[PDB]
């Protein structure tokens, strides 16, 4: 997280957060965000997730590849296409004030070997 007092239930219905570890991040605007996204409603995973953290995202910590973006400055984006989510993230970064607020579902630890290299 980046604000401790956040209650997901106050912003989402339980159906929207079932099984998710939902946290609030405040990211200070400096430099470029360099947070890449993938997914979207038009995609097989049906949600917006972080594909790479290159760097304002890297420097904040707290957000990594696989984490889901559920809201941007209070607007819920779980039903956005990828392009819509990128536009909203870029707009939030450019316009507005000193910080952006990202609500994220933190991806849990992997209980599998995600680095097999055999052929």
């Amino acid at each position: 997280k980046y604000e401790e007092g956040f209650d997901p239930y106050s912003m989402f219905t339980p159906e929207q957060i079932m099984g998710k570890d939902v946290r609030l991040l405040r990211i200070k605007k400096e430099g470029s965000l360099d947070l890449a996204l993938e997914g979207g409603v038009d995609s097989p995973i049906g949600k917006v997730v972080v594909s790479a953290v290159y760097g304002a995202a890297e420097r904040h910590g707290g957000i990594v590849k696989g984490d889901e973006i559920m809201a941007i400055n209070g607007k819920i984006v779980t039903d956005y296409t990828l392009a819509e989510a990128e536009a909203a993230l870029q707009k939030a970064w450019n316009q507005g004030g000193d910080w952006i607020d990202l609500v994220v579902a933190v991806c849990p630890p992997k209980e599998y070997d995600d680095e097999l290299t055999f052929f």
Binding site: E38, G39, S43, P44, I45, V49, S51, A52, Y54, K65, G66, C107, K110, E111, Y112, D113, D114, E115, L116, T117, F118, F119
Partner: protein
């Protein structure tokens, strides 16, 4: 005698010496047709500055890594061919009436790099040819001429010089060998040139190793704890940079190794190509077996451990002296609990003793023959979190092979289901997931960082079956 761009400059150069060496930075391009594009003025001038820096003619204190200079000189000329003749003229300019031997030596290194990337255009080629031919006494000049011939034959590079090319250039060395590693813990040095294609390396490897064929094999780059196949039709040095760039984006030149391995396991019949079996196949299949990816009985494991011990140790019966170390190299990790250390040792020694009259090579082939009809033989494996099937465990094992895509229960090793190629209708991947669709049917969705690899293998198998 010495051929010069003087007369060429009358027709094709800008107007203001200009075709001769100078330490003064250019302010517009040299060629009139490049000069005609104000939008190319800045790149043409930055190229010249980098050339000046590379040859040591830039009175700066901030010294640059050489690869950054060669990237600046050549990268945009590859994308915008209008700049290609400009780079040639800028280099030959600095090589003309250059009375500083260090600078001139460095200029010839740039011409050598350049002729490995793209040729001059039709109109400049006879001038570049005569420039080189009248200076055939310079160390790198004969090879510059040959490289122009070769790049006209194969077509132009897509990526600027690799650090291996630049290090040869800075040594004034035109012959380059690259180490290639094999799955049996050996390596060979392979000669490569600017226009070597991945498949050319493989051809030479198959000769060197006396393989009957390298169909379904390729080069691979081991880099940042990934192992990434190289495209057979690509230029070797283009592939190295393209994959490096990709790794740097998807996750200081990066350390790397190039391996030669089997990629596609199609119609593999152990004993048909014994060299392929004993260099490649045994040593790729052994670690997948030891990881416990196959459904194996205790008696299966005893039998195969006898062959594995023989393949690894030949006649040396002393290495089972300490079971805690060595058992992990002989028995799949899901089965070691099945019997105690001394019972494994006794059983394996009895099995091994049957191979006294076999060679190591014969033991490796026998190991392969005994497992080659298993549905999980000849596979790449992926552990993933699947999110599409409630009745499967969250974490499943996936095999991709000649048969399509297999879903495997990690605890029991049973085959949950098979997606044959003849029934897969689509698949897609991101950096966090892989998805596949069957018929009208069934869908698989899973969390993995290896979607790009699954995609590569599925595409490659489908392409090979279609051909």
């Amino acid at each position: 005698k010495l051929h010069t761009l003087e007369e060429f400059s009358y027709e094709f150069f800008r107007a203001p010496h200009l075709w001769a060496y100078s330490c003064e930075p250019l302010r517009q391009p040299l060629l009139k047709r490049v000069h005609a594009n104000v939008d190319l003025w800045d790149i043409a001038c930055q190229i010249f500055v980098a050339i000046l820096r590379y040859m040591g003619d830039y009175p700066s204190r901030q010294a640059w890594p050489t690869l950054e200079l060669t990237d600046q000189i050549f990268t945009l000329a590859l994308q915008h061919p209008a700049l290609q003749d400009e780079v040639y003229c800028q280099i030959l300019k600095q090589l003309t009436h250059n009375s500083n031997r260090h600078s001139e030596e460095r200029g010839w290194q740039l011409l050598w790099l350049c002729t490995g990337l793209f040729p001059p255009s039709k109109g400049l080629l006879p001038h570049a040819q005569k420039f080189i031919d009248t200076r055939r006494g310079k160390l790198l000049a004969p090879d510059c001429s040959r490289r122009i011939q070769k790049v006209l034959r194969t077509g132009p590079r897509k990526q600027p010089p690799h650090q291996v090319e630049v290090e040869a250039a800075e040594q004034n060395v035109s012959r380059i060998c690259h180490k290639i590693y094999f799955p049996n813990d050996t390596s060979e040095m392979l000669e490569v040139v600017a226009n070597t294609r991945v498949r050319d390396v493989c051809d030479s490897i198959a000769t060197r190793l006396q393989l009957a064929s390298w169909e379904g094999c390729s080069l691979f780059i081991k880099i940042s704890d990934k192992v990434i196949s190289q495209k057979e039709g690509d230029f070797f040095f283009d592939s190295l940079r393209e994959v490096s760039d990709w790794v740097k984006k998807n996750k200081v030149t990066l350390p790397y190794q190039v391996y030669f391995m089997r990629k596609l396991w199609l119609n593999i019949s152990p004993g048909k190509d014994v060299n392929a079996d004993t260099i490649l196949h045994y040593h790729q299949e052994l670690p997948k077996y030891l990881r416990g990816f196959h459904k194996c009985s205790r008696e299966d494991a005893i039998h195969l451990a006898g062959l594995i011990y023989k393949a690894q140790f030949n006649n040396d019966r002393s290495q089972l002296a300490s079971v805690p170390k060595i058992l992990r190299e002989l028995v799949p990790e899901n089965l070691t609990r099945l019997m105690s250390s001394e019972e494994w040792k006794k059983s394996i020694l009895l099995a091994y003793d049957k191979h006294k009259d076999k060679t190591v090579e014969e033991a490796k082939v026998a190991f392969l023959k005994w497992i080659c009809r298993w549905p999980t033989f000849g596979s790449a494996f992926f552990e993933v979190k699947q999110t599409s099937e409630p009745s499967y465990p969250d974490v499943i094992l996936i095999a991709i092979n000649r048969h399509g895509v297999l879903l495997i229960h990690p605890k029991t090793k049973d085959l949950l289901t098979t997606y044959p190629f003849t029934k897969i209708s689509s698949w897609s991947s991101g950096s966090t997931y892989f998805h596949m669709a069957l018929g009208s049917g069934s869908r698989l969705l899973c969390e993995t960082s290896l979607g790009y690899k699954m995609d590569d293998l599925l595409t490659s198998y489908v392409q090979q079956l279609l051909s």
